[PDB]
Nucleic acid binder design. Structure first.
Lengths: 260, 1540
RNA sequence: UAUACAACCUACUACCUCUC
RNA sequence: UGAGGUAGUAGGUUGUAUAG
RNA sequence: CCUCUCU
RNA sequence: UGAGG
């Protein structure tokens, strides 16, 4: 291990043993300053062990002449809960090497997508797997709006308490149906009612009830009556296009059918 | 019999024809083989006997694919001419330049038609015309118009026409098949040639058996739902909104939506819900793949309509409630009847029994029906666990996943296949018990192809039809049947389909009929590859040909020529006797050819093909005669060898009044002076030394390196003897006594059975002290010798005796050796210095202050020693002398009174410690010069100035690469687990490795898993496809000119060509050649073994090729293996009398060394030699008990009568004892000069000795040595030395086979003066046309040897710093067939090979695609791939054999091993550089050194743990090692697949 | 799920002392 | 060679505190 | 007159 | 432009 090697090098050179200074550091990560005879070095990580094993690498490299400061497993689980993705399974699946300094390989499988993280400590390897998977999966007040619109956990410990499968591609159509019952019944009594003088007034009321702010824009077309694109601010990414007159009846119809 | 393919190719060669084979993948090969058969005149310019070939296609896509097929499978320049290049806009001049440059012209019918009409090219110039999809001829199609150009032409020089047609008649055109096929034959001027239905190829038209056709009619039941109407209205509103948007195109959007509407009309609401998901995926992919925002908007709105349609269909389904009831109730009557039919037909029947194919028309219907079927099956607890659905359509990933789906069906994992309509080509699936055509048939091809899959007579062919169309479909099916039967009748007659016996001189019979079988058996014996045996080719002589061979006789009779494989002895055509019947004419050709073979031999007395054993028995007396005298025969462990001392050491004991020679031994420390090494530096360089005194003179010896504990030193024996004459016997007695004193007392080598040996028989010489007594010469030290006959014993001292004697004097302890009576028992130590200042009372200098030393010595041992009597004397400073007696693997201030003083000089005590090691190196160095002098004399290089009497030996060199692990004190020595699950596996194809991703990184199929997929998986599928995770002007023979990953002359070849460069053989090299690895010394023989082994193989190859020129590679390889076998070299070296003088035991001077001048008692030793009866019984325990001493050990040489009787009784009693083992040979062998040497160390020595001659003298001189060792019996006519220049062994005729030989010669880096060698090198046994020369097999035997020696010479000289173990691994990797195959593909030499094997061509194409994917570099994936040697195969041996044959052909033409080296180096330089930086290792070594996989080896079966799966893979191989290697290779493939 | 501190146990590594 | 000590590494356990 | 193909 | 409808 890095520390072991620096430790052994001091013994062999018959010099002073290294002194390790750990401070609390920035964010959630401690910083480790290796003090060695006739040289000074620095290495910072999430945990004291992690910072020490980085400090060691940096000083060792200067003699011969990265660590995130958060719980990436937890962060990945929270991200999956937020995006409605099958929850990640991170499990150490292979231990190999000398019992003094072994090598652990751990798999992370979000649905069928697996990425492997390997390291010298069981926890570090799990964190490594989690980091690799998060980057691939990836490639904030919205979640407040989506919380009022529909019941959603938005974090793992909230979920762990209640005890998700994940929204399959086939079942994404139920997004509007899964809106809070109070919001739905109101948006329906608004649709069924014909008290409003104009269909534009009805469309705005049903969308306002569901807390959807419409994005009406100018679509370029070869037509006398303008063709407009009504974009919506929701996860489902509803986008409609119709002539000016029909634009407001189509909003009403889509909402009716989906809400049913 | 011959291939259906090769029988077609020959017919097309003789006559024009329309090749028809329904089953695919054969026409490409047939087209390629017909093209090469008409390629003889391709190279010549079009003005002078020039011809070019055409390949017309109906479509641009097919023309492109054929143009590339011809580029990949042939060595002829190809020109692709289609509309997209504006061919219409060309000139006569441009067209003439195009036909000059290119040789094959691939294009569409419209292009060439204009070309031949504008008279740009003429029909006479062309040689062959191949019409792909020739069924398109009918009408005014350009195919037909081109053939009409053939009606108005020369009519003498008309090109051959070949028509390849998958489908004979165009879609739904069955009015009059007979007339249409007759018109097609008239159009193409050739009869349709098809192949009869057989195991080799199935013809759908020529099969008789018909399945039980069932007409299942489904009711209209048109109850229209409103959900479909709402969806339709919504989709049409979208259509209106889309046409108006102004902008991954609008047409694509319309396409997908219309297809969904088809699925909803034809297959119902449930099927439609499964299919909208497919559209959702495709519109989502295209939205991401959209460059501009306008398009992204169009795809996003299409996707939102898809989500609305998904909802409306899903709510209709829920209104009723993936259950069976939901599916049946809400689906179309067609689908309902099909689902009901599926249940009745496959209800609880065994799964391995049902194989059925369901045919649909559209490609997306497959996906929507597969979903419906999988869900229905999961739902029905009867049809569950009975049927497994799977679909196919008749991008890298799409092709890979379809291939997997078809392989699932063939192996029976998937019972049902939903196939898209057949269209142009048939379906590659086994005969199905039930074929159910779900979608109404629309084509004749569809009906024939689908029906042809229900092969079994019991199979049910159900076709589902509408009630309204029932009457109409009956007629269409009935007309197709009538039509099919008519095609069958027409094609039935187009299907591709006395003698006196010889009596042997020894009574035997060769009936002619048996002769056809006898010739086939002979062909089996000839060296053959896996791809298959080559049978003889029969050809009925043409009537015109009959004229040249025979005159009047050839009238009214036929004649058959038999051409044997080009490997066989009979390379001459054997025309048969003119006979009336064609059948008898074959019985005559076979009989005649068999008789000619018998004359050449190749047949036993009973006319049975000659076996390898019989062939070797014949060569046994000529070569392996010396085997018989050792009770062994070439027809049908370890050995013990006596040890004989060098002749210089034999009978060397000095005598009285005879001149004696003393050779002074000088030790020079090659380390500097620092406190640790100060004593050694001064004491080694002291003028006083010691000398090897003997009667025989000693040769000049080399400086030898010994590694002391303080550093390294050089030991030199003086070249100039000191001549001294002994005056009397007392001086000789003193000499021998002092010699015995040194070994017994100073070195503790003495054993209780050792007696000084005064008989001068063996290893008899003495060691004598020297002083600079005389002014110049060093006189013998008689004083010292008289003083120390025996070393004094450490009596210690009495407390009072201590007080009395004046023991402490400063000068006495200046340099003597002292020991302490207390503590360390008999541990001798050297007084480096005596501190005058220090006194017992002095404060301990040691930083640990114990005040007076008097304190510590008393504290440690108060009882052991009295209080020091003298408190005021100098303190001795001592340095310990190490107790190690082998030296080649790389401060106590005590009190004087307390230490017993040996008065020995102490300058000599260290030097004498190194003496045992020096003597063992002098013993073997003396043997080395014996071998040096002996071999130079035979080579007659003794008189040369440097190799003569003036020769000065060179200091011995240390191999600094030998591991030489050391046990502590200088003796040389002779994790975490985890639990895993269990599984099994199937062999990985070469195709899998081509893909650059690991199995885990592969994205899931969104198509086959539509309902279980998550949006996360869809994102991964897209980014992986983007690659965010994992041509007509350039010839096929073009090298990429970049780093794949003036050649300096080889010195061996320079020494061979020129006498000046020869450097002397050195004593040092010969000591390495005799020193085995077991000797545990700084040098060994494992490197010279490499150069020597390579030379021996090169020389045995060249000798067997010259002596027996007309043999197959099989017999030559077998006889070469016997010549170079460990047994042959063992017997040759034993005959040479060298194995007695071999260094093969580790040097332990205390347990297993009998020192010079001393031996076992003459009485016991005589008993051992005189009586072999008692020899076995004598054991170490018995010998130790002798314990002779005093007179018997020194003055007398025989053990006393009492001792003798006791010994004899003890040993015979040992029979009745615990020690009845009698394996006492090893312990007592050193006592009687016997050494057991493994049979491998002997052959390694013979090769090493050849290596010393090859390195320093050259190939020519080395060849003479093989005659000395009796390996090669040189014939009187031909000298062994001239083996290199010995004969190892129509221009238009040869250049006909070699078309673009310019590019072969450019890529090889050599231009052939005579191309006969080039044609022989490229020819393959299967090739039937080359009758000028033989096959590669003959030249390959020579090339393998040449390449191995040249590569081995390079690695030997250049790569000095590699353990001899790696230099073997490097050599093995470089010469491997796989490494050669890769270089052959990289240099583009695969195209020029001449063979006619379909399998071979198939496997070569796969391997070239794999190598091109890899980057034309030797990776681990190629090494793990199965090869022909491992024993289907994916690495052909032909590719490497052709490269070896080309390397032999280069040498044969040039006759210069430096030019051959230059070519070999230019070819292998990338491999050489790469494998020097990273030497590859064995497959067993990789598997056992893998961190995570613990290999368990049993048809050896390896059980290994790979990422939580324990998989066992079985290795099948003829040999146990071959089966183990196969198992290791299969394992390594699985590890490479599922790695981390 | 991470983190910090203290204890126990197991496997191993470097060095030192004593002894042989 | 055996014994003992010092510093580290990796695994497991236990208890406390902290965040989530 | 339309589909596919071709130029 | 050729084939089919």
């Amino acid at each position: 291990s890095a520390v072991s090697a620096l430790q052994e090098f001091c013994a062999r050179t018959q010099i002073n043993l290294p002194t390790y200074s750990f401070i609390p550091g920035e964010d959630g990560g401690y910083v480790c300053k290796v003090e060695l005879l006739e040289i000074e070095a620095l290495g910072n990580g999430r945990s004291k062990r992690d910072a020490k094993h980085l400090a060691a690498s940096n000083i060792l490299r200067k003699i011969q002449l990265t660590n995130l400061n958060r719980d990436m497993v937890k962060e990945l689980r929270d991200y999956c809960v937020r995006r409605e993705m099958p929850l990640p399974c991170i499990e150490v699946v292979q231990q190999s090497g000398t019992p003094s300094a072994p090598e652990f390989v751990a798999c992370c499988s979000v649905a069928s997508i697996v990425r492997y993280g390997k390291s010298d400590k069981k926890k570090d390897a799990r964190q490594r797997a989690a980091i690799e998977m998060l980057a691939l999966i990836s490639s904030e007040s919205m979640e407040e709006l989506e919380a009022l619109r529909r019941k959603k956990f938005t974090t793992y410990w909230e979920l762990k308490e209640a005890g998700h499968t994940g929204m399959r591609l086939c079942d994404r159509h139920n997004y509007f149906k899964n809106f809070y019952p109070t919001l739905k019944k109101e948006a329906i009594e608004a649709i069924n009612s014909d008290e409003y003088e104009s269909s534009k007034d009805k469309a705005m009321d049903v969308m306002s009830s569901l807390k959807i702010t419409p994005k009406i824009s100018e679509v370029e077309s070869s037509s006398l009556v303008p063709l407009l694109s009504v974009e919506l601010n929701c996860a489902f990414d509803v986008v409609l296009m119709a002539k000016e007159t029909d634009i407001y009846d189509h909003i009403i119809d889509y909402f009716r059918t989906m809400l049913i | 019999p011959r291939g259906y393919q090769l029988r077609l190719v020959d017919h097309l060669t003789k006559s024009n024809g329309i090749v028809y084979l329904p089953t695919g993948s054969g026409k490409t090969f047939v087209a390629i083989l017909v093209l090469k058969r008409f390629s003889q005149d391709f190279d010549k310019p079009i003005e002078s006997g020039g011809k070019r070939a055409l390949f017309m296609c109906n479509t641009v896509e097919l023309a492109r694919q054929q143009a590339m097929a011809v580029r990949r499978c042939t060595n002829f320049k190809v020109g692709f001419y289609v509309g997209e290049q504006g061919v219409d806009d060309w000139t006569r001049g441009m067209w003439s330049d195009e036909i000059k440059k290119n040789q094959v012209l691939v294009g569409t019918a419209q292009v060439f038609l204009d070309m031949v009409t504008q008279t740009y090219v003429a029909l006479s110039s062309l040689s062959v015309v191949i019409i792909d999809e020739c069924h398109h001829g009918t009408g005014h199609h350009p195919f037909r118009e081109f053939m009409r150009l053939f009606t108005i032409a020369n009519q003498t020089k008309l090109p051959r026409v070949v028509g390849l047609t998958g489908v004979l008649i165009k879609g739904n055109e069955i009015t009059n098949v007979a007339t249409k096929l007759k018109e097609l034959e008239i159009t193409y001027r050739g009869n349709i040639i098809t192949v009869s239905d057989t195991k080799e190829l199935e013809n759908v038209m020529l099969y008789a058996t018909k399945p039980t056709e069932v007409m299942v009619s489904f009711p209209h039941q048109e109850q229209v739902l409103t959900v479909t109407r709402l969806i339709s209205a919504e989709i049409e509103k979208f259509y209106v909104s889309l046409d108006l948007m102004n902008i991954s195109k609008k047409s694509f959007v319309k396409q997908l939506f219309n297809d969904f509407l088809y699925q909803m009309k034809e297959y119902g609401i449930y099927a439609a819900s499964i299919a909208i998901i497919s559209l959702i995926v495709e519109f989502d992919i295209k939205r991401r793949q959209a460059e501009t925002l306008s398009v992204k908007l169009m795809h996003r709105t299409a996707l939102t309509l898809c989500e609305k349609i998904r909802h409306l269909l899903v709510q209709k389904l829920q209104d009723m409630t993936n259950t069976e009831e939901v599916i049946m109730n809400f689906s179309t009557p067609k689908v309902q009847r099909f689902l009901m039919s599926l249940k009745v037909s496959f209800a609880d029947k065994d799964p391995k029994d049902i194989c059925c194919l369901v045919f649909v028309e559209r490609r997306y219907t497959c996906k929507c029906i597969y979903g419906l079927l999988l869900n229905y099956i999961q739902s029905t607890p009867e049809l569950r666990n009975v049927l497994t659905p799977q679909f196919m359509v008749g991008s890298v990933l799409e092709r890979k996943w379809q291939k997997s789906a078809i392989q699932q069906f063939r192996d029976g994992n998937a019972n049902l296949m939903i196939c898209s309509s057949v269209l142009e080509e048939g379906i590659d699936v086994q005969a199905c018990n039930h074929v159910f055509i779900l979608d109404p048939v629309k084509t004749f091809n569809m009906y024939v192809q689908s029906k042809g899959r229900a092969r079994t007579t019991e199979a049910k062919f159900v076709l589902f039809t509408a009630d309204k169309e029932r009457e109409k479909t009956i007629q269409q099916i009935y007309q197709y049947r009538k039509a099919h039967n008519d095609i069958a009748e027409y094609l039935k007659d187009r299907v591709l389909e006395d003698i006196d016996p010889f009596t042997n001189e020894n009574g035997a019979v060769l009936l002619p009929n048996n002769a056809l079988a006898i010739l086939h058996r002979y062909c089996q014996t000839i060296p053959t590859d896996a791809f298959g045996f080559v049978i003889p080719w029969f050809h009925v002589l043409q009537e015109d040909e009959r004229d040249r061979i025979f005159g009047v006789s050839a009238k009214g009779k036929h004649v058959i020529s038999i051409n044997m494989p080009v490997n066989c002895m009979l390379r001459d055509t054997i025309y048969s006797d003119p006979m009336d019947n064609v059948k008898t004419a074959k019985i005559s050709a076979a009989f005649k050819a068999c008789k000619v073979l018998y004359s050449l031999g190749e047949l036993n007395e009973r006319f049975v093909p000659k076996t390898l054993k019989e062939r070797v028995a014949s060569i046994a007396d000529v070569h392996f005669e010396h085997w018989n005298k050792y009770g062994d025969s070439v027809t049908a462990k370890d050995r013990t060898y006596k040890t004989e001392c060098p002749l210089e050491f034999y009978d060397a004991l000095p005598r009285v009044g005879e001149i004696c020679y003393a050779y002074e031994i000088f030790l020079e420390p090659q380390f500097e002076s620092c406190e640790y090494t100060e004593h050694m530096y001064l004491n080694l360089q002291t003028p006083r030394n010691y000398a090897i005194l003997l009667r025989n003179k000693l040769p000049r010896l080399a400086e030898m390196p010994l590694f002391s504990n303080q550093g390294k030193l050089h030991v030199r024996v003086a070249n100039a003897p000191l001549e001294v004459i002994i005056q009397n016997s007392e001086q000789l007695e003193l000499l021998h006594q002092f010699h015995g004193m040194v070994f017994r007392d100073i070195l503790k080598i003495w054993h209780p059975f050792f007696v000084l040996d005064r008989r001068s028989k063996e290893n008899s010489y003495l060691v004598v002290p020297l002083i600079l007594g005389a002014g110049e010469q060093k006189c013998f030290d008689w004083e010292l010798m008289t003083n120390f006959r025996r070393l004094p014993q450490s009596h210690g001292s009495n407390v009072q005796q201590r007080e009395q004697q004046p023991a402490p004097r400063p000068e006495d302890f200046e340099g003597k050796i002292v020991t302490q009576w207390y503590a360390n028992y008999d541990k001798p130590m050297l007084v480096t210095k005596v501190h005058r200042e220090l006194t017992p009372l002095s404060y301990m200098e040691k930083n640990q202050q114990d005040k007076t030393y008097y304190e510590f010595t008393m504290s440690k041992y108060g009882n052991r020693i009295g209080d020091v009597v003298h408190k005021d004397k100098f303190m001795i400073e001592v340095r310990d002398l190490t107790e190690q007696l082998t030296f080649y693997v790389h401060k106590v201030i005590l009190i004087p009174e307390l230490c017993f003083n040996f008065n020995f000089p102490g300058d000599l005590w260290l030097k004498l410690i190194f003496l045992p090691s020096i003597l063992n190196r002098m013993y073997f160095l003396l043997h080395a010069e014996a071998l040096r002098k002996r071999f130079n004399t035979y080579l007659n290089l003794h008189l040369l100035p440097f190799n003569g009497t003036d020769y000065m030996p060179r200091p011995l060199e240390i191999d600094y690469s030998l591991k030489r692990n050391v046990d502590p004190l200088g003796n040389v020595i002779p994790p975490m687990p985890t639990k895993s699950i269990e599984a099994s596996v199937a062999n990985l194809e070469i195709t899998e490795f081509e893909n650059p991703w690991q199995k885990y990184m592969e994205p899931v199929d969104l198509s086959r898993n539509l309902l279980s997929t998550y949006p996360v998986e869809l994102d991964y599928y897209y980014h992986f496809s983007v690659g965010n995770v994992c041509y007509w002007a350039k010839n096929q023979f073009h090298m990429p000119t970049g780093n794949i990953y003036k050649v300096k002359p080889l010195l061996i070849l320079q020494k061979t060509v020129s006498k000046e460069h020869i450097t002397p053989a050195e004593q040092g090299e010969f000591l390495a050649a005799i020193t085995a690895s077991s000797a545990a010394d700084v040098f060994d023989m494992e490197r010279l073994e490499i150069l020597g082994d390579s030379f021996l193989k090169l020389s045995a190859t060249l000798y067997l090729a010259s002596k027996y020129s007309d043999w197959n590679e099989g017999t030559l390889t077998e006889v070469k293996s016997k010549l170079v076998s460990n047994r042959n070299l063992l017997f040759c070296l034993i005959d040479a009398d060298i194995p007695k003088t071999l260094n093969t035991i580790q040097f332990t001077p205390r347990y297993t060394w009998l020192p010079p001048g001393i031996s076992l008692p003459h009485n016991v030793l005589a008993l051992w030699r005189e009586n072999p009866e008692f020899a076995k019984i004598i054991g170490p325990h018995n010998l130790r008990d002798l314990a002779l001493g005093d007179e018997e050990s020194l003055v007398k040489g025989n053990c006393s009568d009492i001792n003798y009787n006791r010994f004899v009784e003890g040993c015979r009693a040992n029979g009745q004892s615990f020690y009845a083992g009698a394996d006492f040979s090893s312990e007592v062998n050193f006592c009687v000069g016997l050494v057991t040497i493994p049979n491998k160390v002997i052959a390694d020595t013979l090769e090493a000795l050849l290596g010393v001659i090859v390195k320093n003298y050259g190939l020519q001189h080395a060849f003479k040595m093989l005659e000395y060792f009796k390996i090669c019996r040189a014939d009187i006519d031909k000298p062994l030395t001239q083996l290199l220049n010995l004969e190892l062994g129509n221009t238009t005729e040869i250049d006909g086979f070699l078309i673009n030989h310019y590019y072969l010669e450019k890529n090889l880096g050599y231009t052939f003066k005579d191309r006969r060698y080039l044609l022989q090198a490229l020819t393959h046994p299967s090739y039937p046309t080359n009758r000028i020369t033989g096959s590669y097999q003959e030249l390959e035997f020579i090339g393998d040897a040449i390449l191995d020696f040249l590569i081995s010479a390079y690695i030997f000289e250049n790569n000095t710093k590699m353990n001899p173990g790696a230099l073997t691994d490097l050599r093995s990797a470089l010469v491997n067939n796989t490494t050669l195959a890769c270089i052959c593909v990289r240099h583009r030499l695969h195209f020029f090979i001449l063979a006619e094997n379909a399998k071979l061509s198939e496997i070569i194409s796969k391997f070239v695609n794999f190598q091109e994917s890899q980057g034309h570099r030797v990776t681990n994936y190629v090494r793990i791939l199965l090869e022909e040697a491992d024993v289907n195969v994916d690495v052909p041996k032909a590719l490497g054999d052709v490269l070896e044959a080309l390397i032999a052909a280069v040498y044969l033409d040039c006759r210069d091993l430096q030019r051959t080296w230059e070519v070999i180096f230019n070819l292998f330089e990338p491999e050489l550089q790469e494998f020097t930086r990273k030497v590859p290792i064995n497959h067993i070594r990789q598997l056992v050194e893998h961190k995570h996989a613990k290999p368990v080896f049993s048809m050896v079966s390896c059980q290994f743990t790979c990422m939580e799966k324990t998989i066992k893979v079985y290795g099948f191989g003829s040999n146990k090692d071959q089966a183990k290697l196969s198992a290791a290779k299969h394992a390594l493939q699985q590890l490479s697949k599922c790695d981390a």
